[PDB]
Every structure is written in structure tokens, then in C-alpha cells.
Amino acid sequence: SIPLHAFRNSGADARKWKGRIALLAKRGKETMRTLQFPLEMSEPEAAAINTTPFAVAYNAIEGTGKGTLFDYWAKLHLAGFRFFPSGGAATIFRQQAVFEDASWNAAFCQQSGKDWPWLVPSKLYERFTKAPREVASKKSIEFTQENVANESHVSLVGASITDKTPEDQKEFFLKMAGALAEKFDSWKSANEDRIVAMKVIDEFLKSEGLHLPSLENIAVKCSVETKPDNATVAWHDAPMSGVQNLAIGVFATCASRIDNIYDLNGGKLSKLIQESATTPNVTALSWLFGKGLEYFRTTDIDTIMQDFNIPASAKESIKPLVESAQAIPTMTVLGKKNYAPFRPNFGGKIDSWIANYASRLMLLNDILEQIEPGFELPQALLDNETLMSGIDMTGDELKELIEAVYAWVDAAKQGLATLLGRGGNVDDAVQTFEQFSAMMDTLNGTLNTISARYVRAVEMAGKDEARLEKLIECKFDIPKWCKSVPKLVGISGGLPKVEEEIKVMNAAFKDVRARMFVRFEEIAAYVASKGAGMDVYDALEKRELEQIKAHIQAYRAVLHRIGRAVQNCSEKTKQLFSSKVIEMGVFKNPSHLNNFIFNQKGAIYRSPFDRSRHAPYQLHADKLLKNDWLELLAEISATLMASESTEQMEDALRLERTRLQLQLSGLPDWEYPASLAKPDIEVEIQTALKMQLAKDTVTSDVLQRAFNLYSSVLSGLTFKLLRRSFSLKMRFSVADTTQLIYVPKVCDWAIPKQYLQAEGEIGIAARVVTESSPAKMVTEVEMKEPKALGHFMQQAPHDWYFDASLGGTQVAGRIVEKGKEVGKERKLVGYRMRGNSAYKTVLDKSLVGNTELSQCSMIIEIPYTQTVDADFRAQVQAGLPKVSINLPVKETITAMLFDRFVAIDLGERGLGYAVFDAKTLELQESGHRPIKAITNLLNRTHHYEQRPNQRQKFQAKFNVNLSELRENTVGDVCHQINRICAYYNAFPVLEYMVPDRLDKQLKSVYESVTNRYIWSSTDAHKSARVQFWLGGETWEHPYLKSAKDKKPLVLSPGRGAHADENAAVNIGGKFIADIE
RNA sequence: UACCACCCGUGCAUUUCUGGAUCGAUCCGUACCUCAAUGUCCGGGCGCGCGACGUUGGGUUUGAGGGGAAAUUAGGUGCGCUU
DNA sequence: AAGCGCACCTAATTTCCCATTTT
DNA sequence: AAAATGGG
């Protein structure tokens, strides 16, 4: 019928097509997706929003410093407070002495011969503490022999009674449960009669003839109340004193409780500390972030010591906890009085860290155990002048470095034990791994320098035997363990303080530039005192001293460093400079001049150490020597002095540092006083340079490299000063069910009259409607026909408002909350939710039950612009805050893919396809579909791949989000494969690897598309694939069988394997040959 | 299947309701973010001020995509200096 | 070609996005 | 509506 160009698999329909392929899935999950609704605010309303209280609350919830919840949470874990899921659970733990679990259980195991460790007295006083709940398939809460036996077996042994379960276990509960079922009418009644229930089980055990101690007696002792009411925490462990690293200490405290930690993997360790740290579903955090936060903040230290029965010894470890409690500010936003509603994302953050840190501890253990002792460097190499030059240390300091690395592998093995809870100072083990990583970085750097120098010396020596023989005798191989040591995982959060940041970078830029000019004058003063010259042309007799391991190179090295500065300047500057050089006519080709100056390609000077094969740019020598190149730099700088454009200002600062440094590159070969190389600015110094620096005298290279630190901090500050726009995004999620305000429109509605002739819910409602207004209409439907309300409300004129606790419009509305009957018209306050019909159809489907709204996230985004003045001082300006609701939604699929397959080739301009019958594996149709989004991505990212010096400026200058542009292009290619799949009722067959001939931006796209159809081991790929196919993870073809295992094919729902059309027919051939 | 015609970037204007309910009709849903398309501005390139060169070249969908948020780690790229 | 110092851009890890019932 | 926590 219609051709493929006319076929429409898009929008709500592609989501129905996929909902259906998903229902064909062998295995799969339920997915969510967020829909963002901007809240409508007038400019008056947006101006009236105060973001200061929102900033205070977000910094307490998300900050990892003082006054935050990470600091109250960590200091609870470090004071000796174990966390428990309920309060009941904590009271039983605080009564472990009374129970005598071990003793009782051992006696039962011996007397009965049953050997049932799970039957301890404590697990029984529990089942009579907690009643079960009719989870809604619904459970039942009535006390029956069947009910109680199942509930008691689940609590004690952790599983429901099944046929597989040994009969002895089943009978033991049945007989007990039978006694309990006879004696107690209800779980409610049994829970009240704790002592009586224990007596009953004691009688059951005595009837069976066991001489075990009285549980009833235990119950009387256990029946006193633990003072802090409903506490989910119990003090027990000794306190970890003065841990600067808060999270790393909490992980160690928790891991200390685990036994045989080394056998465990990252997943297992993560799950056992996640349970002890945040507790399952952060149920403990409810109390600590609610009534617990009040207790610690508002109880005499003496009564927090009495109520948890803490020894006087730990008082100094508890004194800090109360300060950390008291420091978190009052919760004043989203109508919330305390922090408990914010627990779900606090848990997610900590649990994320715990999982990532536990994997990193387990990695460092494997790395530390592969460091093989005995690596040594040949004595020859340690005495080849050439291959030990430029490492800032002698051969007797590289020997000592390799010895230092082996000693630090032993200290690192003990630091890891201390971090996995085995014992020690945690803060002196973080330091060990730092000092270990630093030593191993210095060794890896030094050996990369020496191996590079070696392969350069070999090539240059060439055929000369004396050179080659002495070189090959210095040969060494870098050991596999000599690598960057992976760091310990950190944790941070809170808002960037914009006004403070700007103050800091303005202060820093002015101070560093002052200190750089000051030092250069001090160096020039000292060289003047001894009467010598900073002759930059003579100092390139150094080109000679390195060459052994002249004038042409001296003048080419001053014109290549001057030239490379212009390459990083504006087109104004690039022209002013370029013309002057063309007048001189130094270059054989002026094409090469502008190629170098404008296209940033090639060079007019190469260092001898450079392994590059491309010859420097040809020049006429006479012109080069005739003209002073340092003179040009003064002239260009002078032209760009008074421009007052920020782009020209930045060139002025770059060329200033180029002039200062080409003068310092001309210093005579001497020994300098070592205070002419000591930096007063804050910068990282490599440890080789810093041990070279802590001496009486330094070489010219040390003087020069320490001065380049001035320039590297200035160039850094420039990236932060030249930021033009950014936003402060604050996200808040409570643990409360999403409530939407359904506001009927204040307009006359003429209900369609065909609605009366229908047997549906809309029919039922349309029949009973007599009133004019849609607010009065919905009241009339509610009162007369209440089952049909929902369907009538979806059609009746309405708006959607949200009560962010920020004010808004007073509206007459009915609250629409999940698993609740719609509210009665109350007067309410809310901000209208902006959105097209496609988004609002998802809110209307919720009234019927076709969709479920989840707990939402409110996002306050505050926009900012930044500008630099004449003095290059940055200024920031904040716009009106935008508020939005990010609503996670779940949606039901209403109740083809196997009988054909389509091979898809991703090519340069679009895709090709070839469809075969899955039954007969024959060719039925082929075609090519140009995608214009591929051509647009290669056109708008051309100057990010061919102008390398300008990739940190391509986004702000060209107003692009390359991530978003790649997201749109993956959007548009997946759309076209999904459209072809839908049009021919075919499952997609893709090649496994994106070719390496393709542009870097297209390779990225073509690999975010192969990973939504083909299977990938990487979790990120599987997560993306499943969310794309609406929870569908695995599919199984009914009749197609793999050659490899003679198993039915697994699809996802694709299978890994004109030019694009030709290629797809070949991908399809490859797939067929891999099936029976 | 008729249609359309140098290419790219930047800025400006314009378009972009794309979802439901009932039996084409009636009613509900006000339309966010991004990509695009349409015209215009200036700059660059190519050919002969002007541009498709039988023809390809392109387009055809109800234009298309929209799962957020937070922390983390690792890698890559750039600039400068030294050997 | 390497090394270092300072930047920015990208890709992957891990977690959250309860419900039930009492008070 | 807020607090506590069951049921995996």
C-alpha cells in the first residue's frame, strides 16, 4: 500500500509499537521515564520566589561538609552506633545478653538432634513483636495454622514453607503454629499477649520433651522499654577517634563487623555494608532524619549516655555528634518540617558511593598482589649520560626510587587491610595510598621518559655500530605493575558558591600576574649584576649541546614559538602579525605562512628529540637572520594594547607571557640562587622538580620550568574568567505520593450528544449530566454514578496545578493521588503545569488507571551570565529562577517481530537495509534511507576536529551542545531503523563494531545506536537498550537456531553480526551463516 | 508519486496543537526541551554578477527525538615549558 | 617524541524515583 | 498527615 517514505512510526505510535514488541519479551523489567512540566509563573511571581531557603536546604541534604547530613550520619557511625531497620530490631539487639541465643540453640541442636541454628530465642520474641500486612495476591492477616506456620517459617529461616522444604521443619512449625492458631484469634491479639505467646511455645517445646530454658521467662526480662522511643540505632562498638576522612571511616567500621572480607567480591561487600550503613529502604534514616535529629539536637549529653547506656569513655566521641546534629539548619521548604522525607536520595547517594568504593578497595587488592619483586635497571643505562638526562635525578636516585616503590607496596598492603576493617589508623592509610600513587606516578613518568629517549637514540644512531652496541646494552622493559595506581573514591556535593568563586579567580589572576612580572625582573637583575646577557640567540648554542647526544635553528625556534602564540589568538591579531611576516617574505610559500598562522598545521622548528618525520617549513635563511623576531612581538602586543575587546585582552596576556619566557629561554648556562626558582603561587609541583628545587643552586632548566608554573596557573584562570553563561540547578524529592490538583475549566461545555448513546463509563456519566458548569457536572457524576467519574473527568474541561509550597493561583480543585479515590472540591493553591496534549494525556490516563505517577522531583534552576571588564575582572548577574516538576511516570501496555529480519548498515550519509524471511532466509527487499541529521552533525562539528587549538571554545562560541546534538542524531537514526522494522515486521540485525574510518563524532553516534539493538556486556549499554524497548531485555526466536550451541536465538530485540544497501545485504549474509 | 534545485557557517524572522474520548462528525487537550524546515542577513569555498549539474541530488511520516537527577571514576584532547 | 603543570570533553558506575497501617 | 516499617 503506502511506500516507506509515507509510513509513520513516530510519537505516541512508536511508543505503542515498542510497548508491544516488549510484551513479546521472554524476560523484562518495568521501566520509568520522566516528563518535565515547567510551572507557569508570571515575571512578578518568578521575581517573588526566594531561592535562599531552597539553597540552605539543598546544601544540608547534598553537602558533604559541616552542617550537612553526611556529617551527622558519619559521626553516628563513628561514635559506635549500629543502625537497625526498625526500633523493635534495635531493642532485641540491645537485649542479646538476656536471650542467650547461642546457649539455648546449642542445647536444642543437641537435645533434639535437629541441628537448627536459625531457631534462636530472639527470632521468636520477634515474630510476636511485628504483625504482617495485607500487601496488595493479597496476603491475609488472620491467625490460622496455615497462616502462622508460613509467617513464622519466613521470619526464622528467611523463606516461605514450600513442598521442597524438609518435612521435619514443616511439621515443627505446623504443630507450633497449630497450638498458636488454637490459642490466639488474631495477629493483633497475639502481639498484645507477648508473654502468653512465649508460654504457648514453651508448652509446645515441653510437650515435645525438650529441657530448654523458658522463653516466657526471657519475655518478662525483654518486656522493659528502651528509653529513646522507637530508636533505629543502638550504641555498641568503640568510637573511631578523629577520622578526617568521614565516609572512608564509616565503610571501615562497617567492614570490621564482616568476617572473611577478602573472599567476598565488590557486589557482596557492597550489599553487606549498604545494609549496615543506610539499612534496607533507609528505614533507620526515617527516625534519625526525623525524631532522632530532634533528640540528638535537643537532649542533655548525660541523658543520651543514660538512654543508650554509653560508657563514660566514649563521651568525647559523642560530644562531636551532638555538634554535628545541632549544625544542620531547620527544614523550611516543600511544606516539610524535618529531613525524613528527603531520605530516599540521601540513601541513593551513600549507597552509590559504598558500591563504587567497595569495588575500588577490591581492585587495589589485586593490583597490590601483582607487584612482583626483583625489577632492576641495567648498570649501563644508569651510566648512559643521554638516557638519564631530563628526569631531574641521577642513576643512584632511580635505583633508590625502585627500592622505595617496593617498600611502599608492603605499606599499601597494610593500608588496604585497615580500610577493609582489619584494624589500624584509617587516616594514615589514605595517606599511604596517596604517597604510594605519587611514588608509582614518578617511576612511571621517569621510565616513560627513558624508554622514549632510548627509541629516539636508537633511530638517530642508525647504522653506526659503536653507538648501537653501547645503546642496546642499556635495554630495559617497563614492568606491567608500573602503572597509575587507581585513587580511593571520594564523595562531595552542595551548590557552587558563585559570588565567592568570582571573588577568588579575580583576586588570583591579578596576584599571579603581579608575582610573575616581579620574579622576571628579579632574574634579569641577577644576570645584569654579573654583567652577562639574556641573549636568546646565543642561548640556542644549547641546540648544539643537545644535538651532540646552529644559527638557523636559533632564529627558527624564536619564530616558531612567536608563531604558535599567534595561532592561539583572534583573526585580528592573526592578520596584524601575518602581514608583517609576508613583507619580510621569509617563507618559500606564503601559503604555508597562513596555513601555519591560520589553519594551525605543521611547524617551522622541530626539537632533535621529536620523533616526527615531517620536515620543518622551508624558509629563506637570509631574511630569517636579517629581521629581529622579538621586535615584532613588542609591535603586535602594542597594537592589541588599547583594543578593550576581551578576545584582544586575552591575546595581550598570552603574548606578554611569550615575551617574558623567550627572554628567560636566553639565560646563560650558570647556577642560580634557588630562590629565583621557588614559586610563591599555589600550583602542583612534580616531586623530582621539588627535590631539585630544595638545593643551594639550580640549573637554567629548573629556573625556566618553575617560571612556566606561573604561566600555567594564569592560563588556567583564563578558562574560568572567560565563562559566559551557567545555571545553579537544585533538585528536591520527598518520600510522599505525587498529588496533582485537577482544576475544572470555568467555561460552558456542550457534552457531545453521541456520549448518551454509549454503554461505557462516559455513557453512564453523560446520561446523568443536567448541570451547565464542568465543576458542577463532575459533582453530579460523582454523587449519582461514582464508578464512571474518572472517564468523565478525563473529558470534562480541566487544568493541572501543582502545590510546590511556593504560593501560586487559588483554584477550586480535586486532588488526584495514586491508589486513592479523587478528592472533593476544596479551595487549593498551585502553579499551572505547562505542556502539550501528548504529555497531559499521560496525566489524564492516570485517573482511569492506565498510567501511574511516581514520586516527583521539583527542580529550581537559577540562570547566570558572566562578563569581564577592561581590567579582565569577571562580574556575574543572576536571572529569575525557573521551577519545574520532573515526574517519573509508569504506563501500562495495551495487549510481527519474528517472521522476518532486516540487516541495517550504518554508512557515511545514511543507512541501507535488506529484508529476508526468517523461515527461508531469502532476500525479499533492499533499500537505502538518507539521514539528513548525519550530514548536519558533520557540518556543525567540522571546526572542532580541524581546529584543534579551539575545542575548549567550540561550544560557547558556536552556541552548541555537542552531547545534545549527538542525542538528537541518535534519536533520528534509531527512528529510521524503528520505522523500517515496523514497516516490514522485521527484527534488526546490526554489525557489532562501528568502523574506525568514520569521524569521531559519527563513531560516537553509530555506537549509541548499535547498543540499542545488539547485546553488550557493559551495564550502561544494557540499561540504555532496556529503557529504549520499554523494559524488554531478552527475546527468544520461536524457530531460528544458533550454529554454535544449537539453541533458539536470543534477541535484544536485534542480533549482532547503493553502498549502504550493498553493505546491509552483506551484514545479512553474515547473520544467516551464524544460524542453522 | 508528482515536486524541488551551487555548498557551508553565523545572526534575525517564521512554522512546528502532531495527543485522547465517543459514534468522517462532535468534544476534550494551549502546546515544554532539542533537532529541523521555511525565508532573510553577512562571511567563506567551488564553478560559469549568475548557479542542480539526460541527470543525478534531495525531500515526502500527523517533520523527528525527548529519563531524569546526583555523586563518582577512568580515559581522551588542548595549551605552555624543558630534555 | 616524551615528561610535567594547567584546562575542557566523554564514557561508564551506582543509586534513587515504596506501600501499608497506625497514630 | 505524619510517623513507623513490612516485604521482599
Side-chain angles (χ1 to χ4, degrees), chain A residues 1-458 460-670 672-683 685-783 786-908 910-1069 1071-1075:
Chain A
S1 46
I2 85 275
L4 167 63
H5 69 74
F7 189 74
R8 195 230 191 211
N9 198 44
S10 327
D13 297 344
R15 205 165 286 273
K16 289 181 187 182
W17 172 80
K18 286 194 297 174
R20 297 197 303 277
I21 305 293
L23 291 180
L24 272 183
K26 199 92 160 305
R27 186 195 66 240
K29 61 179 63 177
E30 57 172 354
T31 51
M32 323 173 79
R33 83 189 178 105
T34 296
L35 294 186
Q36 312 191 51
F37 296 86
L39 293 193
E40 188 135 75
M41 310 189 165
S42 69
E43 274 65 38
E45 284 180 330
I49 301 307
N50 191 202
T51 48
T52 304
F54 283 86
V56 168
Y58 185 87
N59 278 344
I61 294 160
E62 295 275 24
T64 319
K66 200 281 313 176
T68 78
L69 296 172
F70 173 99
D71 193 14
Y72 164 79
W73 166 83
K75 288 199 189 146
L76 280 154
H77 274 290
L78 294 175
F81 279 103
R82 304 208 166 184
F83 290 28
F84 306 87
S86 74
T91 284
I92 269 68
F93 165 89
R94 297 172 58 170
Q95 285 153 352
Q96 273 318 113
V98 151
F99 281 118
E100 284 296 283
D101 283 345
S103 344
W104 195 100
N105 175 244
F108 171 75
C109 294
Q110 294 317 292
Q111 281 173 49
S112 201
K114 273 331 179 202
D115 308 321
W116 289 344
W118 46 264
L119 182 62
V120 290
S122 59
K123 292 297 299 171
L124 301 175
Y125 179 83
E126 152 201 7
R127 197 69 209 86
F128 285 86
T129 292
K130 46 138 130 194
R133 297 173 180 167
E134 288 200 353
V135 272
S137 190
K138 271 247 271 61
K139 195 124 77 165
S140 202
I141 53 157
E142 296 198 337
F143 223 72
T144 91
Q145 316 198 8
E146 170 259 319
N147 274 356
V148 183
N150 195 24
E151 273 126 15
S152 38
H153 192 256
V154 179
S155 65
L156 261 74
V157 216
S160 298
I161 313 198
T162 63
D163 292 27
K164 297 161 188 68
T165 306
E167 61 161 359
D168 293 356
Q169 296 205 7
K170 163 202 70 186
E171 290 155 339
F172 176 79
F173 280 101
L174 275 181
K175 292 157 189 170
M176 177 189 304
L180 297 169
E182 234 61 34
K183 269 73 171 194
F184 295 107
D185 56 316
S186 186
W187 270 107
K188 293 185 182 182
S189 69
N191 286 197
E192 299 150 13
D193 320 324
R194 256 180 224 157
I195 323 259
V196 181
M198 288 310 104
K199 297 175 192 112
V200 172
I201 313 174
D202 215 61
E203 291 154 9
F204 155 76
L205 285 159
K206 282 179 170 176
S207 82
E208 256 53 46
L210 289 325
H211 261 221
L212 296 169
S214 261
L215 305 110
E216 24 161 343
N217 214 336
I218 271 147
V220 195
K221 309 151 130 299
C222 277
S223 68
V224 190
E225 61 293 339
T226 56
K227 301 271 272 68
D229 222 9
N230 312 345
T232 58
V233 73
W235 197 93
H236 181 82
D237 308 351
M240 252 188 201
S241 185
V243 192
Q244 304 309 304
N245 315 287
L246 283 187
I248 287 199
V250 174
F251 189 104
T253 314
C254 292
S256 88
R257 306 167 185 181
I258 299 180
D259 300 327
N260 304 338
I261 200 141
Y262 283 104
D263 307 327
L264 275 50
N265 72 354
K268 294 171 189 72
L269 181 50
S270 173
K271 300 298 175 61
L272 295 174
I273 304 203
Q274 279 170 345
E275 293 170 7
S276 308
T278 59
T279 75
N281 284 204
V282 292
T283 57
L285 296 182
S286 180
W287 190 81
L288 292 165
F289 295 173
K291 312 203 83 167
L293 200 22
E294 190 57 22
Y295 181 73
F296 283 121
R297 291 170 53 92
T298 332
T299 306
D300 169 25
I301 202 56
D302 291 336
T303 312
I304 313 172
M305 294 265 295
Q306 168 147 329
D307 291 8
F308 292 88
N309 302 118
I310 309 177
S313 64
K315 201 176 195 63
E316 305 309 329
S317 183
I318 274 67
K319 221 70 51 53
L321 177 52
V322 186
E323 295 145 24
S324 186
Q326 277 165 339
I328 316 164
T330 303
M331 174 49 78
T332 61
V333 303
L334 283 97
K336 299 311 186 190
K337 333 145 297 136
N338 64 62
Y339 283 92
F342 297 94
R343 69 178 170 278
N345 279 113
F346 183 97
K349 202 211 197 118
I350 292 311
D351 284 6
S352 182
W353 180 79
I354 289 168
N356 285 308
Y357 184 72
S359 280
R360 179 55 47 91
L361 288 199
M362 260 29 230
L363 184 60
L364 286 176
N365 183 26
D366 309 351
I367 294 167
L368 277 178
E369 262 60 15
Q370 301 257 355
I371 317 287
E372 5 228 344
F375 171 65
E376 277 218 49
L377 284 173
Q379 184 57 18
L381 184 149
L382 289 178
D383 300 344
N384 184 345
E385 288 94 316
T386 79
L387 307 181
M388 291 291 304
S389 274
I391 62 180
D392 298 326
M393 56 183 59
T394 74
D396 301 359
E397 296 176 347
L398 185 55
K399 260 189 331 266
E400 279 156 1
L401 180 60
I402 303 154
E403 295 320 287
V405 153
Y406 278 132
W408 277 81
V409 168
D410 319 322
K413 280 176 193 195
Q414 298 183 306
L416 191 107
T418 301
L419 290 180
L420 282 169
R422 305 304 101 177
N425 193 333
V426 173
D427 292 357
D428 313 352
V430 185
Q431 196 165 337
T432 298
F433 266 95
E434 293 164 359
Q435 292 296 157
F436 174 61
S437 312
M439 267 147 235
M440 186 75 69
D441 259 0
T442 313
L443 182 60
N444 196 211
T446 304
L447 291 180
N448 284 316
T449 306
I450 303 173
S451 174
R453 222 161 287 284
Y454 182 86
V455 84
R456 190 48 188 167
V458 163
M460 291 312 293
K463 300 218 65 54
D464 193 2
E465 285 302 323
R467 291 209 52 83
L468 259 209
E469 289 302 313
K470 290 304 134 294
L471 280 173
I472 64 183
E473 299 164 12
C474 306
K475 185 168 185 185
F476 83 101
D477 44 304
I478 314 197
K480 300 299 134 192
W481 52 268
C482 198
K483 273 175 324 217
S484 182
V485 181
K487 73 170 299 268
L488 298 168
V489 180
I491 163 152
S492 171
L495 276 150
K497 9 183 45 66
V498 180
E499 282 71 59
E500 228 161 283
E501 271 130 33
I502 291 270
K503 284 169 197 186
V504 162
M505 67 178 98
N506 288 335
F509 197 82
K510 151 204 75 208
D511 185 39
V512 177
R513 232 188 111 208
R515 288 190 191 267
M516 182 187 214
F517 274 111
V518 158
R519 174 68 51 81
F520 170 95
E521 110 226 328
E522 286 187 19
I523 284 156
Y526 168 97
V527 161
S529 117
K530 316 220 138 147
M534 276 156 107
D535 213 341
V536 331
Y537 292 111
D538 290 9
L540 264 301
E541 96 277 271
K542 286 183 340 182
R543 172 67 198 231
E544 302 171 348
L545 70 97
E546 269 122 51
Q547 188 57 48
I548 296 156
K549 309 150 139 174
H551 213 193
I552 298 313
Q553 265 67 37
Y555 267 91
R556 270 178 125 169
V558 176
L559 186 59
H560 169 270
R561 281 170 64 181
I562 287 168
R564 283 264 283 121
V566 176
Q567 288 181 346
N568 306 340
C569 296
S570 67
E571 272 293 338
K572 298 309 303 182
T573 305
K574 287 178 172 179
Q575 299 298 356
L576 304 178
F577 170 80
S578 181
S579 59
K580 302 178 187 183
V581 223
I582 231 152
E583 295 150 22
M584 292 140 201
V586 42
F587 271 80
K588 294 214 193 329
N589 277 242
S591 177
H592 297 343
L593 180 57
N594 291 26
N595 179 9
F596 179 89
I597 295 184
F598 297 90
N599 305 170
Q600 287 72 224
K601 173 272 172 63
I604 92 134
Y605 177 69
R606 295 211 162 280
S607 114
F609 295 120
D610 204 325
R611 222 117 69 223
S612 173
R613 38 89 28 94
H614 316 97
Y617 276 137
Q618 292 164 17
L619 312 168
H620 313 121
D622 19 282
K623 331 282 202 186
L624 185 76
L625 307 158
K626 268 206 77 221
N627 314 129
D628 183 48
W629 303 115
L630 289 146
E631 139 175 337
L632 274 211
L633 202 70
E635 270 111 70
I636 278 87
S637 208
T639 70
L640 322 174
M641 233 140 234
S643 190
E644 285 342 279
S645 346
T646 75
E647 196 171 10
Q648 299 299 159
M649 243 124 57
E650 91 158 318
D651 304 345
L653 299 157
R654 160 173 256 95
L655 305 176
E656 127 207 313
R657 295 185 319 255
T658 291
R659 187 204 48 260
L660 288 193
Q661 286 190 123
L662 267 166
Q663 259 121 78
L664 242 114
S665 132
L667 278 177
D669 254 56
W670 281 347
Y672 293 81
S675 297
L676 302 190
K678 194 250 164 88
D680 10 69
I681 59 157
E682 301 180 54
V683 57
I685 319 199
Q686 64 263 47
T687 171
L689 179 65
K690 110 167 39 252
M691 69 190 211
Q692 252 185 346
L693 274 184
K695 286 181 185 156
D696 36 31
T697 39
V698 296
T699 59
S700 265
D701 39 289
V702 178
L703 180 34
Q704 280 153 226
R705 280 173 290 118
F707 196 80
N708 193 196
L709 299 179
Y710 278 120
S711 133
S712 71
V713 173
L714 275 170
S715 181
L717 280 165
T718 300
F719 278 110
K720 327 224 89 110
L721 280 170
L722 289 195
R723 187 182 45 174
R724 289 211 313 275
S725 62
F726 58 102
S727 51
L728 287 202
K729 179 149 52 162
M730 299 180 272
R731 184 265 286 106
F732 306 86
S733 316
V734 291
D736 302 73
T737 329
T738 296
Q739 291 181 343
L740 299 194
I741 310 179
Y742 170 112
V743 180
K745 270 185 183 89
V746 197
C747 80
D748 45 274
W749 181 33
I751 301 189
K753 303 193 305 307
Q754 68 265 6
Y755 277 170
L756 291 72
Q757 302 184 357
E759 277 68 37
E761 301 94 342
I762 195 62
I764 293 157
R767 278 190 281 279
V768 312
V769 165
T770 74
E771 320 257 333
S772 145
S773 133
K776 287 161 107 206
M777 268 170 185
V778 298
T779 325
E780 217 199 357
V781 170
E782 181 182 28
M783 66 153 291
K787 280 165 149 181
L789 181 59
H791 277 87
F792 184 72
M793 280 192 127
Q794 165 171 6
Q795 294 304 325
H798 69 277
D799 279 310
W800 291 113
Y801 280 63
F802 188 87
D803 181 34
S805 296
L806 279 173
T809 336
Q810 302 279 342
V811 283
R814 295 174 168 271
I815 295 189
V816 171
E817 188 196 314
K818 173 157 78 175
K820 275 201 181 163
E821 68 176 330
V822 182
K824 311 301 182 66
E825 204 110 11
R826 304 166 42 190
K827 305 189 166 291
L828 295 172
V829 211
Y831 285 103
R832 213 186 117 253
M833 291 166 62
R834 303 191 61 235
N836 69 321
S837 65
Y839 274 33
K840 277 170 173 159
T841 294
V842 174
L843 305 184
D844 291 345
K845 285 183 172 181
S846 97
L847 304 147
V848 160
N850 191 19
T851 281
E852 300 167 22
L853 311 184
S854 306
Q855 288 171 174
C856 80
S857 5
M858 200 205 42
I859 305 199
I860 307 198
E861 193 151 9
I862 309 148
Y864 277 92
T865 27
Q866 186 178 308
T867 27
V868 262
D869 64 13
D871 259 327
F872 220 69
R873 152 159 161 159
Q875 290 98 23
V876 106
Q877 195 175 323
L880 294 181
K882 312 193 321 195
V883 187
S884 176
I885 306 307
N886 285 31
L887 190 51
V889 302
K890 287 171 169 194
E891 299 169 0
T892 257
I893 312 176
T894 317
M896 188 192 207
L897 192 271
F898 297 130
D899 277 36
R900 269 171 302 276
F901 68 90
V902 57
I904 296 292
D905 178 55
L906 303 181
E908 309 212 327
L911 43 90
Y913 46 88
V915 180
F916 324 69
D917 178 14
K919 249 150 222 312
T920 184
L921 311 166
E922 297 171 351
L923 192 49
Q924 296 179 344
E925 179 278 342
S926 56
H928 93 274
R929 280 287 318 168
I931 289 102
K932 228 219 311 251
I934 292 151
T935 317
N936 170 74
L937 179 85
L938 304 184
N939 290 339
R940 298 186 70 195
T941 69
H942 189 60
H943 308 318
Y944 180 90
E945 318 298 356
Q946 312 304 147
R947 286 285 167 270
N949 56 338
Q950 302 283 345
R951 288 173 180 159
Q952 307 184 222
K953 291 173 176 55
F954 183 66
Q955 278 183 354
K957 181 180 173 182
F958 288 84
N959 290 316
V960 287
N961 199 327
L962 285 193
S963 261
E964 280 178 4
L965 197 63
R966 279 188 315 266
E967 218 170 23
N968 284 103
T969 316
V970 166
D972 294 16
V973 176
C974 287
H975 168 85
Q976 285 300 318
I977 302 163
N978 281 349
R979 182 148 176 262
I980 290 163
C981 286
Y983 180 82
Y984 295 95
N985 289 113
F987 64 87
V989 171
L990 274 288
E991 204 142 19
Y992 273 113
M993 309 305 175
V994 164
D996 300 1
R997 72 182 181 176
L998 289 182
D999 183 27
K1000 173 217 64 186
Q1001 306 276 342
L1002 196 58
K1003 280 205 57 182
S1004 174
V1005 159
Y1006 281 172
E1007 283 159 352
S1008 282
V1009 170
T1010 305
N1011 288 167
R1012 283 179 176 193
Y1013 300 94
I1014 298 185
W1015 174 75
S1016 236
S1017 45
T1018 309
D1019 271 33
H1021 305 176
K1022 201 226 197 220
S1023 157
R1025 214 172 77 255
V1026 172
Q1027 181 77 30
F1028 184 77
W1029 288 108
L1030 305 177
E1033 314 160 16
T1034 279
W1035 285 260
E1036 199 210 49
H1037 198 286
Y1039 52 91
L1040 277 183
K1041 307 263 172 150
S1042 156
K1044 198 135 286 178
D1045 23 74
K1046 290 297 143 13
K1047 282 182 137 293
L1049 283 190
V1050 176
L1051 308 174
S1052 40
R1055 188 90 184 159
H1058 195 282
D1060 268 285
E1061 178 171 345
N1062 169 53
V1065 180
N1066 299 347
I1067 293 171
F1071 166 79
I1072 289 168
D1074 301 315
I1075 80 203

